[model samples]
Target: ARLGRQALLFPLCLVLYEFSTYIGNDMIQPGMLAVVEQYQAGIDWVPTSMTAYLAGGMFLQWLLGPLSDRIGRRPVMLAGVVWFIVTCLAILLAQNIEQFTLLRFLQGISLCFIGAVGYAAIRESFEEAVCIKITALMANVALIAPLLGPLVGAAWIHVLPWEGMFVLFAALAAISFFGLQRAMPETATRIGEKLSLKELGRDYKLVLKNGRFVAGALALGFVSLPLLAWIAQSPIIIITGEQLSSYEYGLLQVPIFGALIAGNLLLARLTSRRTVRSLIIMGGWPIMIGLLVAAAATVISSHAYLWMTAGLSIYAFGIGLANAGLVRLTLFASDMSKGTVSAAMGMLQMLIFTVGIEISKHAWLNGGNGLFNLFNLVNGILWLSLMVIFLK
Candidate 1:
């Protein structure tokens, strides 16, 4: 049970790798206003950039999963981190919004390696309870990235230009590169098989046939949509729409992401005390209620954001509670490869997230709370409703 060097290696390296992607993604958001103005491009590029990044994650994840299975985890992960560093450096040289967005897409591909390869390795290497806890702890990156990134970016940009952020990201990726080189163990043993199209098709077919995985994977995306929407919309909504300062835009994230952090913390503790079903149920109620309150706040008070923040915090808390446990369950839904299964699940979730953000853009661009809250509310109900059915 004592994992020796692996104990520190697995969580530390994976988390650092996760941090590098978000540094590029979320941290760059505050600078996007400057990016568009400099490029003289459409304002829509702000959110569209995020979509491109999410799309990047989806584009390569399926391949990375099977590829890691065939070649082994360490090489694929090192390659992905290398690509991530290269993409971050490229962001510094981009001449236009199109170029920059393309770079973001390329940078986002690193997430595929993290989700498909790194996460799968964690599950493969650890005990059920320990893996659950590690995954729950890692979900804190979900909390802290959006939580701290913008605030850090907001402050950092004031001192240094926006492009410098990528330099910092590149540095982080460089650190990941070394740490991975030193500590990452090869996790896949099913390496003798050829990565054939027929083989890929059959593997994925087996993974996808499970009903719980399909729904639970989707739930992961749906539940996170509101948070992603807020992340995407907040700059435009607060800075442009509300006409607030960038630092102010950064500060408001505390309520939503802060509560989500609390939820993850609680979920981490609850893993030992509660069943995954019980944990999901504990979150289910708050998710619906919180979003409903968000919708209601739009009508109830003139200060929609204030009240909605309260509502969204509760929703975030619920998401934090359920996300890790449900992910563990979904990945285990099939006896197939965790690499393939995690890829399928992760790909499904991000695809949903990518599409979900696009759908929420109507409200996001217009600076309206009503449509955005309604969109989030509807997502909450739908994912929660389906999860209830199959989590049994």
Candidate 2:
């Protein structure tokens, strides 16, 4: 194994496969209005469609881990890709919003594969430093895929039907399929776990019982909540709350996401020079300081967006700085099958985000300005959990 080549080439396969699911979700956003018109569905289903995708992402959370552990990461990954392609193409024939949302959900299950199989395989195949660097690079795509998908989707829909977006998803996935098939290596330690009600319960119970894993998993999601919720809340915070122009709203996004990307690049550069524990401790400084500033934005009631942008940018840098290390630590926290552990991590993270976002969504409806403060609460809780693991 040429470690250098694997480090450079293999993460792409994992990223590409992950991007297919994102394409299914993000690329369709710009075309929702057209789809609604064509299907004659109520306008309210627009947001509901997006929720369906996120729900679909977590639907298979329990099953994927056990399946990957029982079979292997490679086959399960390929099967997921195949299903992703099939679901994307099937949406072309969907005649109504209900059918479209169902298919969108099925397409969404592909996202779970990335968490369960793709990330676990990368973690197992590479050195800890190299794997964390690769993780940061793959994470950069999260910003880009949604960033570009909607741009391309908006552009493409102007020239073609909305249905063409799924076709492009199908086509892009097809290319990634071949790329993945050729490059992906099996990384699961064979467990041969059987699928049964009793067996799954036992395996999950073993992983969740470890306080370190549970704490690390919660920390992972909490630290990530600020960034994740920003994506959803930005339109309201910027356009509606701040009374900014749409262009200004878009401009504001650059610093928030780019700061995170810059930090990820910085982390990638430092992987070989430092230990994971060292990176995280150093990274924590920015997190605590930036989050405090962001929390202040809620009460200032003047120049709120500037405070938010500056504080969140700093906070996002810290997130990029330490995110991969947290993932690595959490995945290793439990020695149960890596697949099972990975699935538990993915599921917990999603659960946290779902609840956190819903709370924020309602808070905004009531003119509650304390949203960033809630992120601070989660960050504070993260450190309390870290105390249990760190002092160990």
Candidate 3:
């Protein structure tokens, strides 16, 4: 049952989760060369803006998650959303990569709060059965966001300036902010004291020290690493190698999201009887096989692009199922602070993603053509093995 409060406003938060990708990839980084010219910076300095925003957001996400556990969701979330919107607006008016990067980093950091609190609100508002339904809803929303983010970004760019994209983000954020203010209630479970640095460190130690947590964290981490690597690398593969337009890359994102939605629907039905762990294991196999198939297809000198897209679609779909299953499994252990655990989950994922993106970025930048796409198959193999070793 949807509560009478601002619970409905929660889904708008998911829009940023997807739309931000468009802003980052489609509008900002791809246009970085041009953006830098306006600011008098060298082209080499352009990508750092992307890196800074990504790194800063990931770092703060680690903090924001745990903070939500201690303080409260509403305030942390509001702080995050407001900060992000404000910084996005700043970017709309910024002159150089320096200001742009700073604002983007701040914008990314703010999202950490939104990501942590938004998911938890589902669990808090619904019963067990209802939570599963909500998860499915989340899956659908997730697909729709990315599917349209790039599409929207591309359309907006066709009509407006690059900075105009920032304006769009800022406007959307403002809408989300007001929605939160109007409808969202404080979704905090309890008022707990803030965790000290040492205490927080101890929690990390506890997570590592616990075999189950380690297994769960690693399973999810490994699952996530390749997916992010793929996203980071896709632009280079499609743009430089395939000679596809930015619009084509955006269109590709839609199918990937469609697969995500399809996987979620299939898994939701399958998991009704099967254990969540079983579902993750099942979902994991497709990604593993998909990677292997894509690699083999490349070795055989087949139509590389078509085969790779098909393979990665399977991999992405499997991840969608695994994501839902993992969250469901995590929710079973009721004693832990949901916020802290969520933070830990996201932090670990981002850390893995950071490493993966950097490695993939290096391979694409330094290695010859076809290396980026080849690395997707490679990273998938690593993530698949990690899942088997850690999750099982």
Candidate 4:
């Protein structure tokens, strides 16, 4: 019964993540870039906006997780949802890049709660096997948005203005707010610890000094770098560079997710009775193949979009294994404080991704085949090496 109800949580939470992903990456960053080019202001400033949003979200998760623990889940989540709705309207009304970037920061803060609450809720609410299944399901749910976001943004660009995208976001956030208020019972019971700034600082110190916590964090953090880099670059490489309309890019997700669904089914069967290490080893191979293929595509193909998308699909499938294993390790190591651990891992993943996005945007915008090629080439090598390390 808890699991079934918990399953309901995935949709609303996935929406929160997807909404943030769309606005942060698609509507705000790309729209600001288009706006810059519209006024002939130069495209170089666009990457900085991407960096600021990524960094702001990454840094804030560290605090938001702890704050949620102190304040109780209901209020923190509601606040995040409200912040998102307000930020969407702000982006909808912004007239300049500076205002857009500032609003993006606020938006990042709002989205931080998605990973914080969702991950912890799963941890608190589900068993290890159940968590794996639910996590896979959640990915399938969340993937709908990213797969659609650029395509949606691309379509809106063709017909409606960019501001129209935020309208969609505002409406979704408003919907999510009321939906949660009605459905979500308070899962977090307030432990008698003081929910104050001083106690938060103390908890931060404890999480930092714990070696297991540090290890758990680094495990996810290191892997997230390549993941974030791929996400940040996908729109620029696929939608913008290939001249694909939003609809076409949106169409690509079906195939990508087809690969993920296959991977998840395989995981369900094999990991049903097997160790997570078995899943991890199996998962590593697909990413290794994908990375090598990506590098080869840059070298061998003039039609970059097809090969890149094919390789990206393979990479996405491989991550299913890593995600499952990482969640298990994080949950077990955290002594079953799933939410806190999820937030801790989230903070680390955010920080790693923040750096990766910053570097990728700078790399892509700097006008060098060397830098552009270097992004995937280095990432490919690093990703392959991580697979090998995980195997051992």
Best by lDDT: 1
| Alpha-carbon TM-score of each model against the true structure | 0.91, 0.78, 0.82, 0.80
Number of the top-ranking candidate, with TM-score as the measure: 1
Q: If ranked by lDDT, best first, what sequence of candidates would result?
A: 1, 2, 3, 4
Q: If the candidates were sorted by their TM-score against the true structure, best first, what order would they fall in?
A: 1, 3, 4, 2
- Worst lDDT run of 10 residues, candidate 1, spans 1-10
lDDT per residue, candidate 2, 329-351, as tens digits? Answer: 88888888776787788888877
Error of 4 at 24 (Å): 5.5
Write down the TM-score for model 1: 0.91
Better of 1 and 2 by lDDT: 1
| Tens digits of per-residue lDDT for model 4, 184-277 | 5555655445667776666656666666656656656554455455545655555566777556766765566566656766776777687876
Q: Give the local distance difference test score of model 4.
A: 0.62
* lDDT of candidate 4 at residue 216, scale 0 to 100: 52
> Whole-model Cα lDDT per candidate?
0.82, 0.73, 0.64, 0.62
Q: Which residue pairs show collisions in model 2?
A: none
Preferred candidate (lDDT higher): 1 or 4? 1
Deviating ranges (above 4 Å) for candidate 2: 1-13, 23-51, 68-75, 89-103, 118-140, 146-164, 180-197, 239-246, 372-391
Count of steric clashes across candidates, in order? 0, 0, 1, 2
Off by over 4 Å in 4: 1-35, 38-41, 45-50, 118-137, 191-193, 196-199, 205-216, 222-224, 238-258, 299-303, 334-336, 366-373, 380-392
